[PDB]
Ligand binder design. Structure first.
Ligand SMILES: NCC(=O)NS(=O)(=O)OC[C@H]1O[C@@H](n2cnc3c(N)ncnc32)[C@H](O)[C@@H]1O
Ligand SMILES: NCC(=O)NS(=O)(=O)OC[C@H]1O[C@@H](n2cnc3c(N)ncnc32)[C@H](O)[C@@H]1O
Ligand SMILES: [Mg+2]
Ligand SMILES: [Mg+2]
Ligand SMILES: [Zn+2]
Ligand SMILES: [Zn+2]
Lengths: 447, 429
């Protein structure tokens, strides 16, 4: 079986993900994140926010609405150009992406729903934004779009943020949140969904420096993934050819990750575009509000250029999950060797930081173990598990990437210490209970 | 006085706009109070409230686990939940300005027959523009939890009594906006469904009412500005047998009180209807007693943006004159401000190095504009708990002055001890 299938099966079995509304018929275009998945996702997001906003003098945060005034998407150009060609099978009348079927221009292709082949309608352009209606009347007055990107909420607040945060280019505005696209086909696993969270930052610079700032952010974003544990050899850069450039972008470089898809194993992870002055210029023109920047140090006025790192939170989750997956040979209690599944997460991403495992269900072990679990829950997400053989419980934690297991044994009742097991090496060290929190805090690398 | 121990909402809203806690969404095209963006300070305050809720509900409790579910679920979910049929309110259209309102027109001064209008927002998925593609944006986050109840029982190995908690965006086609950010069409909720053996539900209901009240108090809200309001039967939602709201004294004109959080006993309504409509059994089998039952549900359902409005209003204060947001340090959006006495080659690099050290842990502001007293007032006004001054003596004793927001008391602390000094006082990161 393929690596992606193996990882997807683990994720489903341990509740990283569940298909949304599965009891009614789920698809891979919409996914829920279970108890382990919601923590992993939140940890990735928190590390992005820390790297982008908390740690940087020159980047501030914002959170804008999914549903903006419709005029925003007229001005941005999305109403006019955010569409893709659809063809309709002449036998089963299902519609498909013409470009995708052409895998470029061909002519007579096969239908992946009935197989008829050759019988297609002429192409029709299909706008990829999702629609809704606000107010009691479902009319054009009430028509709104769910945002296909978070970026326009940032651009429309550029002058507000310059004023309230007292920022001057070069500086950035960063944001996380849900975006929506009427994707015609789902992807492998969670790769391509109609609803997905993005992590986007618009970095406003003086125009003559934009190309240098573009390279800075390409290299900085690449290094962000590596610093959080992704193997650099599973990352690469991809330059958009001119025909693949979005309407707002003069140059775009994708970070791609080696997901392991059948055929071509590489996929887009994050896009880093130079959007020049397109977005502030068009909103200035359409709104009548001046979004240019006045540099008092030179008495000059200019429309900033924009460098945009635009990451996908759920695509990132998929990459971190796949990259952490590993099998190694581990001794078992019997004296033999097992194949052991381990998610080798960076400790800042792992959904459960520590597992508290009494050696057995013995009544004398539970008090100290329960008291210790309660102490650690003040700081971290913790799992308590007393069911079954200790060795099996260690492997249950290894399988979801837990960095440390703490075992309470009968000697603990006399020396008031516990055994701390490290996930990757499986090495154990005996630590006094009153120092366990500090012992873990240093190794978990939190804030 | 707002703490008995121009209205306050206008004053707080003006401050929040001036300092960028909020901006009306799409303002440059015409904003309204039904949609709001959160600026650099607002996004941090919002995230801090959310993270304290998650910590109290999920991280700190053995018996509660988390989930995050899609805004857009299969349409069949909202048929089964009853929302398609009953999530509607009476609308009265004016006969002079033809504007519809929630059943004296506040648009022309002076009426149509009431017509029931469903409050869920619709969207259309897939390539067929027609009602085959019709979906609803979720009006509550709870149905994502109920539809996964059996899934979570299996993978998390939980047994009633236990909860599943979630935060996320919900959508309602509210007809008129509220004061400030009180009632928007798009808002974030923080909801937990607590699943229990039916005979215990009324005791668990009271437990969660008291626990949720205490959560606001522990995070700094004046208990005198919170109260409990029981829904009468006519006001109960279709899924609820009993509902108690926590209300906050927002300070509106007329009646100053408003709903903050709803705590409902949803009995077995939700798991029973999805079991029936889906054909998947969402009952719980108790092996200890060889008994199978549909859990009752107790539901604390908080509003993140309504909570932000309450924490912001409650923190507002004027003393000696000085404007101060008296935030609990865990909620304050900027934890520390670093202030070089003068912007200068000998002090500024030391101040910057300290700001960078602290930004490893906390959101920090560096400010070198204007006199020090002015910079203290700028920080007090947005609730920053501590200000650290780097001055010329710092270059000799390698210590800085640390000012506490509320007392304005100052203490001189060595730089290699400042982080730990601040950590025990900020109580979170
Ligand atoms: N503002 C600039 C921009 O939007 N750029 S981008 O169009 O490239 O989307 C930015 C990122 O969002 C993620 N992403 C995009 N679409 C999807 C989807 N359907 N499912 C999952 N992740 C997605 C993906 O990781 C992508 O790199
Ligand atoms: N699941 C059970 C439930 O939903 N119950 S509830 O209907 O009460 O919504 C839960 C909470 O969401 C918040 N809330 C509700 N509607 C809005 C709105 N339009 N704007 C802002 N906040 C709102 C508010 O704080 C409310 O107490
Ligand atoms: Mg910053
Ligand atoms: Mg928990
Ligand atoms: Zn066909
Ligand atoms: Zn009227």
């Amino acid at each position: 079986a393929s690596i992606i299938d193996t990882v997807a099966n683990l994720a489903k079995r341990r509740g990283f993900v569940y298909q949304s509304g599965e009891i009614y018929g789920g698809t891979r275009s919409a996914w829920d994140y279970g108890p382990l998945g919601v923590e992993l996702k939140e940890n990735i997001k928190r590390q992005w926010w820390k790297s982008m906003v908390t740690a940087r003098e020159d980047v501030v945060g914002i959170d804008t609405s999914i549903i903006l005034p419709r005029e925003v998407w007229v001005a941005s150009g999305h109403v006019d150009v955010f569409h893709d060609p659809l063809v309709e099978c002449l036998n089963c009348h299902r519609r498909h992406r013409q470009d995708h079927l052409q895998e470029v221009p061909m002519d007579e292709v096969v239908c992946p729903d009935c197989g008829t082949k050759g019988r297609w309608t002429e192409p029709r352009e299909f706008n990829m934004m999702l629609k809704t209606y606000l107010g009691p009347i479902e009319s054009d007055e009430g028509l709104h779009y769910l945002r296909p990107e978070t970026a326009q909420g940032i651009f429309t607040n550029f002058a507000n943020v310059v004023t309230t945060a007292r920022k001057k280019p070069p500086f950035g505005i960063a944001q996380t949140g849900k975006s929506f696209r009427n994707e015609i086909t789902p992807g492998n696993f969670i790769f391509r969904t109609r609803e997905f969270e993005q992590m986007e930052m618009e970095f406003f610079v003086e125009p003559s420096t934009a190309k240098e700032w573009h390279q800075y952010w390409i290299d900085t974003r690449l290094q962000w993934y590596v610093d959080l544990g992704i193997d650099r050899d599973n990352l690469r850069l991809y330059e958009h050819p001119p025909e693949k450039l979005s309407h707002y972008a003069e140059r775009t470089v994708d970070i791609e990750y080696k997901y392991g898809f059948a055929g071509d194993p590489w996929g887009e992870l994050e896009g880093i575009a130079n959007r020049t002055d397109f977005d502030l210029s068009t909103h200035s023109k359409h709104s009548g509000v001046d979004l240019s920047y006045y540099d008092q140090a030179t008495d000059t006025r200019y429309v900033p250029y924009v460098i945009e790192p635009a990451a996908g939170l759920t695509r990132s989750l998929m990459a971190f999950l796949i990259d952490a997956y590993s099998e190694d040979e581990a001794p078992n209690a019997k004296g033999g060797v097992d194949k052991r599944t381990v998610l080798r997460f960076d400790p800042r991403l792992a959904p459960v930081k520590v597992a508290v495992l009494p050696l057995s269900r013995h009544a004398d072990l539970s008090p100290k173990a329960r008291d210790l679990a309660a102490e650690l829950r003040q700081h971290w997400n913790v799992e308590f598990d007393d069911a079954g053989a200790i060795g099996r419980r260690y492997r249950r934690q290894d399988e979801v990437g837990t960095p440390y297991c703490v075992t309470v044994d009968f000697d603990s009742l006399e020396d008031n210490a516990v055994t701390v097991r490290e996930r990757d090496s499986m090495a154990q060290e005996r630590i006094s209970i009153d120092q366990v929190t500090d012992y873990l805090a240093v190794r978990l690398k939190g804030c």
